[PDB]
């Protein structure tokens, strides 16, 4: 399956800059912005400038309306770039102008081409103030009309795992890392499959036209790695706001080396199937990281959460 | 790049004390590997809690060059490990 990752606005561009730097195997990177100078500044894959007629390349002025109008003016360039994809991840920091307003247009264009359309977006930190949070929530509502799955990562949740005395700059770096881990934790089922390989049609089944989603991850080493990593994922602060038995779909990626035991795959799946509703679509597969020894990662995406 | 700095802080003929910077986000545990640079032996491995910023590697041999590698295993990132060389 052909996977494209598109950063929208400045935050989404910084996130994609990080994924390009740290690398996600098997995906193709793009960046969409109204700010032409920001587009050119760093390596973010191919660049797509939107709204040059109305913004003159000078940005959206933190105004979601301008981001929307900019993307509306350039649906043709968006469609031309998206064509050929089986799946697209749209990454954006919501609460500014371009991400908030242009991301739902990018998503609408992609949905129209029949692409499986997954948004991965952040809500701002509390310290960024009430108006940015309001803009973010309105843009997420607009976005939810035009995606297959919309994964929200609230930056306020990341606050509680940040080291003390952290710099303001490293706090945003951490947001990039979580977004990168989020895309990577879904994409690697496709691009680095292990033994229990997920068919892209089953990815589509658990993600297509599901609406809101959240994800959590766990990691563990040693004899109890499977139980420990699964429970850590389900206890994740990024998942704590939802009842997992309420999700209409659950996608699980177990990342392992070549030493996965049957009883470990059994354990992870039994734990998921216990907390998931009896009528949920449940897809569990494995991915391969050969540089692991006696350890495991479990990534859980709860989809269709309402 | 996590940890972002890794150094040998003290060295004896059969042991090395390594130190790294505190991480920006919670690390669940660190995986530490080490072995002779270009060796027919598999590297040896151990883990330390994610609250540590040092570890001691023992059972080494004098005058051997070693490659040491630290993986920070976090639920919140997939950052690459950091690696150094050091001769006892
Ligand atoms: N992941 C990430 N998020 C950011 C970064 N900078 C800002 N953000 C978040 O993204 C939101 C939107 O800001 P920005 O993307 O710069 O505005 P836009 O270009 O008008 O879409 C901000 O309110 C922050 O919460 C960054 O470097 N990385």
Numbering used by the authors:
A (entry chain A): 11 to 316
B (entry chain B): 2 to 89
What is written in the article reporting this PDB entry?
FtsZ is a tubulin homolog GTPase protein that is widely conserved in bacteria and plays a key role in a complex called divisome, which carries out cell division. FtsZ polymerizes into protofilaments to form the Z-ring that acts as a scaffold for accessory proteins during cell division. FtsZ treadmilling, a motion in which the protofilament polymerizes in one end (plus-end) and depolymerizes in the other end (minus-end), drives cell wall synthesis that constricts the Z-ring to form a septum of the cell. In order to aid high-resolution structure determination of the FtsZ protofilament, we developed a monobody (Mb) that binds to both KpFtsZ and EcFtsZ with high affinity.
Two crystal forms of KpFtsZtr complexed with the Mb and two crystal forms of truncated EcFtsZ (residues 11–316; EcFtsZtr) complexed with the Mb were obtained under the same crystallization conditions. The structures of the two crystal forms (P212121 and P21) of the KpFtsZtr–Mb and EcFtsZtr–Mb complexes were determined using molecular replacement with the KpFtsZtr crystal structure (Protein Data Bank (PDB) code: 6LL528) as the reference, at resolutions of 2.20 and 2.50 (KpFtsZtr–Mb) and 1.84 and 2.60 Å (EcFtsZtr–Mb), respectively. FtsZ in the P212121 and P21 crystals of the KpFtsZtr–Mb and EcFtsZtr–Mb complexes all showed the R conformation, and the crystals contained one and three complex molecules per asymmetric unit, respectively. As the P212121 and P21 crystal structures of KpFtsZtr–Mb were very similar to those of EcFtsZtr–Mb (a root-mean-square deviation (r.m.s.d.) of 0.245 Å for 366 Cα atoms for the P212121 datasets and 0.341 Å for 340 Cα atoms for the P21 datasets; Supplementary Fig. 7a, b), we hereafter describe the crystal structures of KpFtsZtr–Mb. We used EcFtsZ as a target for this selection as EcFtsZ and KpFtsZ are highly homologous with a sequence identity of 98.7%. Additionally, all the crystal structures of KpFtsZ-Mb and EcFtsZ-Mb in this study adopt the R conformation regardless of either straight or curved protofilament-like structures.
